[PDB]
Amino acid sequence: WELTILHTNDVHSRLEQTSEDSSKCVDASRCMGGVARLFTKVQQIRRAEPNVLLLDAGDQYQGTIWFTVYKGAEVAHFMNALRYDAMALGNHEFDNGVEGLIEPLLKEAKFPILSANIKAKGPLASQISGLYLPYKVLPVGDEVVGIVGYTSKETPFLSNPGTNLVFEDEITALQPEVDKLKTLNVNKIIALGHSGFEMDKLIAQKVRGVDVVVGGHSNTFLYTGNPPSKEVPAGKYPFIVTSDDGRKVPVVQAYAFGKYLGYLKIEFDERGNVISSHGNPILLDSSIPEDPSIKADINKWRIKLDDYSTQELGKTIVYLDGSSQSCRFRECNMGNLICDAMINNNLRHTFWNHVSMCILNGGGIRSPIDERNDGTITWENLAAVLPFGGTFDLVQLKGSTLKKAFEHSVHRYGQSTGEFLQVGGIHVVYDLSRKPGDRVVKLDVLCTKCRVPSYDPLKMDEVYKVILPNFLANGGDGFQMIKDELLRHDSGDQDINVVSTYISKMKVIYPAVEGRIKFS
Amino acid sequence: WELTILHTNDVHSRLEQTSEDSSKCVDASRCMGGVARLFTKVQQIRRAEPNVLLLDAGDQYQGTIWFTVYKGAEVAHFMNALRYDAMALGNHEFDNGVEGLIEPLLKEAKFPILSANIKAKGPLASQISGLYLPYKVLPVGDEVVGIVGYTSKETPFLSNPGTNLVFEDEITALQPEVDKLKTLNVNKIIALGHSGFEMDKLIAQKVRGVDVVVGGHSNTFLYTGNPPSKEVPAGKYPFIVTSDDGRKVPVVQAYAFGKYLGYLKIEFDERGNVISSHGNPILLDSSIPEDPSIKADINKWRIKLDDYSTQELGKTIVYLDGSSQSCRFRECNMGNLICDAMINNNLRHTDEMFWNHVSMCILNGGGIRSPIDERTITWENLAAVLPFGGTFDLVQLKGSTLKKAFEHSVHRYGQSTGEFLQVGGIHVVYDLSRKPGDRVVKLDVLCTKCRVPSYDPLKMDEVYKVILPNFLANGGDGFQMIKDELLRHDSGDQDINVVSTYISKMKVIYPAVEGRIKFS
Ligand SMILES: CN(Cc1ccccc1)c1nc(Cl)nc2c1ncn2CCCCCOP(=O)(O)CP(=O)(O)O
Ligand SMILES: CN(Cc1ccccc1)c1nc(Cl)nc2c1ncn2CCCCCOP(=O)(O)CP(=O)(O)O
Ligand SMILES: [Cl-]
Ligand SMILES: [Zn+2]
Ligand SMILES: [Zn+2]
Ligand SMILES: [Zn+2]
């Protein structure tokens, strides 16, 4: 009995087909992804394979003006259209609180939305009861397949789930649910959740009874063979984990932004043991046509969004690289633009200026902006780069705290983690061959108590004013040292307004990669 | 017989009283220098001393909006008013060619303008004949004093003297002219010229018959005792050189910008032998009042400058370092500002293969003639930074030509030479421990045929477009390889206009030293 699993994760409001960098589609002849194109491939596989399951491993929320306007009603509508078989809750599904999850998604989804390690308490327990389930038994042909859900344990730190939701250990909470499925003589069990590739591998190893793990959160790209686009594989597809009880357990993930459709075929035996498994994510490129019914429906929702593009804020003559593969691994000119804007909004009278430095987590830059659209930069383009609606605050940090933040910036370098810092008024050099915690070899900063601004070595006993996102001021992305050691905090202007005012002032921008970040 | 010599040098259009940094006078109670104040002190000394000579050692041309506008007619007018007894030609008296020297100055000066080592040839020899002289015999009391002139031998590389003027050795060309004076039984001879303190010391040593040397060009400050202002003496005043024939020969110089008045008393005997000499430059500070006749005449020439040169273009919150000690030895933020303006003026859409058609800039540090203090930016403040009225041209250069230009930039590093290049869109690293001609160790340039601008190693076989002053495009400052090897030359907008339009767009500027020029 062969099962075909189709899976998506971290789609992030990429409902319309996108460019190859996951930004707004301009040259439609080379655009990719989108629900319309996804519908075609999904309906293609359903007519070829008898047993098909379409799953989503979380983080459909947040990413473009689609979620800004419809706040999740677009997710429920178009996930229903594609006839998804199950969904796991991600951390971003809570960005608008529990109420932002219950009303638009949990109450309007025609498919089960799962999470086994989320426990509701107090007044919410009655309201959110049964709107999400720890597992679901799905009939597939004349067989049944069990799907247990899990959501990041650290979700209270990543989103806004509230005080009345308890997020338990994934493994601790999954084992009882898998055992209850086995008492129901469900011998085929998929672990579908949103905790990251590293937690997916522990669930495959530690949780007895899970045959497959379908994950997300880490934007992991797995491929066996020659990859078809720019994403570099982090491992074979499927990534095989050997469990504690000796069974080979495939672990899968399909990058992000709906660019690929995960595709895995499992051959089970009569008792639900995995005989073999093979597959590879399917690049949803121009060769696959967009479904016209889904596309027409998309275009009827699109005109409510078109008022976020009428005004031109300015022009860019260069590609504004806001891609994770860039801003999370090295200096990206999108980060330099934002940090240049943050410092420019903070031009006050004290020496030469009160602030000279800026830091910005690469994980806070959520999209690039294309320059082939006549160079036009609209509020919409910016809305996808800075979709959270946070502020760019002013902070005071001892040099010691700043060095610790930059050590953290690359303490686990290589995993596309979002704590890699883009900077302004700072020249940092890393030596990755050195130990974690000892990788910053040079850290020069732009002086304030000086008549001519120049770069001087950071001194740990000194105190520096830095402009950073409020998300970092609150210890987000693991920067707890900023929250615990900062000596002063003042709240600033909205992020997208700071970047928008600057673009309007400069009229034409051309930020470059200048060497603010170097590697030894 | 005691002679009192009053001497000025490298005034550079400092006709009006200035701040203590020789910039625009703002707080008039604390201003210094100026022609009016000089007239008072010179008159005071002539009313006290019997034998007085007022001499200038060159470089009255070029420095402020006074010369940019009046092109030397202000020099002739007020040098006559002050009753200068002689002037030596400097290298900057040729910045506007011979025509720019003959028309306003040589043609309107009521005093002798001297230079013994400038020889005219071919068609010019008759045209400029007698308009400048190798020597002059002047009555001083009931005695007669001879004055031989000399001009920097390297003036063809520093200015625009043309092809029909030969600059001979000061010593080689001076010895016959001094021999000419003693056969006329003139036993008192002053060597008044513009070649630098180091050459002045050779003329005192090598040319027999010279009793005193009055120099310029090196802005050398000499003082005996505690100096009265910020300038640090480079030696006693007078600096005594022992000639090859055993005579003690005083050498004098008086800084620059009309801040000081040189003052030297020489006691001769009946045979023209120097018995002794003493003195010290007189600081022309608020304590000396401005002469009312020269001052009123100054205010009547000011009306052509104040009605067009007093507009505010913008603000700077940082000190704009255009000082020679910085811009000729290391990256200086005034140079970065100018190059950033040059690049911003050349931001035209040419082809869809470029972020912009040109990305790079080079600028001879010796072309940056003043700083701007941040303690309002007007067209006049800028006029002192860029007083030549040149253009910022676009040139095509093979990488080899660019590498040779950057090798030349530091081939004689350490003598405050003006060929040291300020850059934009270029990251150059020098290793001065290496041989001259092999000191550039890294030379990265900003890409043009690229969607995201980034720095890549310079290719000697490729061709790059560079924006540079017209002075460099024509082989000035020894940049022969640029003129000889450039593959294309187009004239651009005026220097001060480009730097001015840029400041107006930015409203507030704050250039920094970013690492464009580094030393290994
Ligand atoms: C909604 N808001 C406002 C606010 C105000 C005050 C305090 C906290 C928040 C937010 N503002 C900002 Cl500025 N960053 C936020 C954020 N809410 C979340 N973040 C971080 C996401 C970065 C990526 C993490 O991980 P990642 O990108 O590696 C994986 P995932 O696929 O996203 O799970
Ligand atoms: C008006 N024009 C156009 C042009 C074109 C072709 C030929 C001559 C002029 C000029 N444009 C520019 Cl861009 N630089 C100029 C310049 N004319 C002269 N320069 C260089 C000055 C170097 C100074 C060395 O001397 P220095 O700075 O070491 C100290 P001193 O003041 O001599 O004591
Ligand atoms: Cl007089
Ligand atoms: Zn997530
Ligand atoms: Zn001079
Ligand atoms: Zn000179």
mmCIF file of C-alpha atoms in Angstrom, chain A residues 20 317-321 333 340 343-344 347 351-353 370-372 427 446 451-455 502 505-506 508 510-515 518, chain B residues 317-321 333 340 343-344 347 354-356 373-375 427 446 450-455 502 505-506 508 510-515 518:
data_model
loop_
_atom_site.group_PDB
_atom_site.id
_atom_site.type_symbol
_atom_site.label_atom_id
_atom_site.label_comp_id
_atom_site.label_asym_id
_atom_site.label_seq_id
_atom_site.Cartn_x
_atom_site.Cartn_y
_atom_site.Cartn_z
ATOM 1 C CA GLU A 20 12.214 33.479 -8.110
ATOM 2 C CA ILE A 317 17.948 51.509 -9.459
ATOM 3 C CA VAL A 318 19.420 48.396 -7.770
ATOM 4 C CA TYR A 319 17.957 45.078 -6.659
ATOM 5 C CA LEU A 320 17.166 45.407 -2.946
ATOM 6 C CA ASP A 321 18.386 42.012 -1.745
ATOM 7 C CA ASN A 333 22.072 45.829 0.706
ATOM 8 C CA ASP A 340 20.807 53.779 6.991
ATOM 9 C CA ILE A 343 20.014 56.253 11.757
ATOM 10 C CA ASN A 344 18.715 59.048 9.502
ATOM 11 C CA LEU A 347 19.233 62.976 13.622
ATOM 12 C CA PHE A 351 28.317 65.986 19.534
ATOM 13 C CA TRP A 352 27.812 65.286 15.783
ATOM 14 C CA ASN A 353 24.716 63.118 16.271
ATOM 15 C CA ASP A 370 12.634 44.031 -7.383
ATOM 16 C CA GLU A 371 13.943 46.977 -9.406
ATOM 17 C CA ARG A 372 12.614 45.807 -12.812
ATOM 18 C CA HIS A 427 32.313 47.336 10.820
ATOM 19 C CA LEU A 446 31.305 54.924 14.320
ATOM 20 C CA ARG A 451 33.771 66.134 15.374
ATOM 21 C CA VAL A 452 34.622 64.010 12.301
ATOM 22 C CA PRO A 453 32.901 60.587 12.372
ATOM 23 C CA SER A 454 35.365 57.727 12.001
ATOM 24 C CA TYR A 455 35.503 54.065 12.990
ATOM 25 C CA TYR A 502 13.810 57.786 3.920
ATOM 26 C CA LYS A 505 13.708 61.818 0.933
ATOM 27 C CA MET A 506 16.323 60.181 -1.269
ATOM 28 C CA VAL A 508 16.378 57.438 -5.873
ATOM 29 C CA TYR A 510 21.181 52.583 -4.541
ATOM 30 C CA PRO A 511 22.438 50.892 -1.358
ATOM 31 C CA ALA A 512 25.433 48.643 -1.907
ATOM 32 C CA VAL A 513 27.352 45.888 -0.159
ATOM 33 C CA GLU A 514 30.244 47.964 1.183
ATOM 34 C CA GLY A 515 32.102 45.697 3.621
ATOM 35 C CA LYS A 518 33.516 40.609 6.616
ATOM 36 C CA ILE B 317 26.602 68.314 11.289
ATOM 37 C CA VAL B 318 30.213 67.086 11.072
ATOM 38 C CA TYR B 319 33.518 68.873 10.512
ATOM 39 C CA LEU B 320 34.269 68.719 6.773
ATOM 40 C CA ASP B 321 37.978 67.886 6.878
ATOM 41 C CA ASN B 333 35.587 62.838 4.732
ATOM 42 C CA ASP B 340 29.827 61.026 -3.577
ATOM 43 C CA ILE B 343 28.832 60.008 -8.570
ATOM 44 C CA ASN B 344 25.389 61.379 -7.730
ATOM 45 C CA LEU B 347 23.314 58.792 -12.201
ATOM 46 C CA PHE B 354 23.849 48.597 -15.325
ATOM 47 C CA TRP B 355 22.761 49.717 -11.894
ATOM 48 C CA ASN B 356 24.402 52.897 -13.207
ATOM 49 C CA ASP B 373 33.848 74.086 10.050
ATOM 50 C CA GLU B 374 30.541 72.787 11.348
ATOM 51 C CA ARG B 375 30.489 75.112 14.369
ATOM 52 C CA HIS B 427 38.450 50.293 -1.910
ATOM 53 C CA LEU B 446 32.236 48.820 -7.360
ATOM 54 C CA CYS B 450 25.550 44.091 -11.842
ATOM 55 C CA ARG B 451 22.067 44.324 -10.341
ATOM 56 C CA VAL B 452 23.265 44.624 -6.715
ATOM 57 C CA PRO B 453 26.370 46.843 -6.418
ATOM 58 C CA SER B 454 29.285 45.103 -4.715
ATOM 59 C CA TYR B 455 33.072 45.411 -4.627
ATOM 60 C CA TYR B 502 24.402 67.382 -3.930
ATOM 61 C CA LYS B 505 19.385 67.518 -2.147
ATOM 62 C CA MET B 506 20.692 66.021 1.093
ATOM 63 C CA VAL B 508 21.949 67.718 6.058
ATOM 64 C CA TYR B 510 27.515 63.889 7.601
ATOM 65 C CA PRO B 511 30.278 62.208 5.577
ATOM 66 C CA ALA B 512 32.544 59.811 7.450
ATOM 67 C CA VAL B 513 35.875 58.058 7.043
ATOM 68 C CA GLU B 514 34.624 54.605 6.081
ATOM 69 C CA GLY B 515 37.718 52.627 5.099
ATOM 70 C CA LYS B 518 43.535 51.639 4.186
#
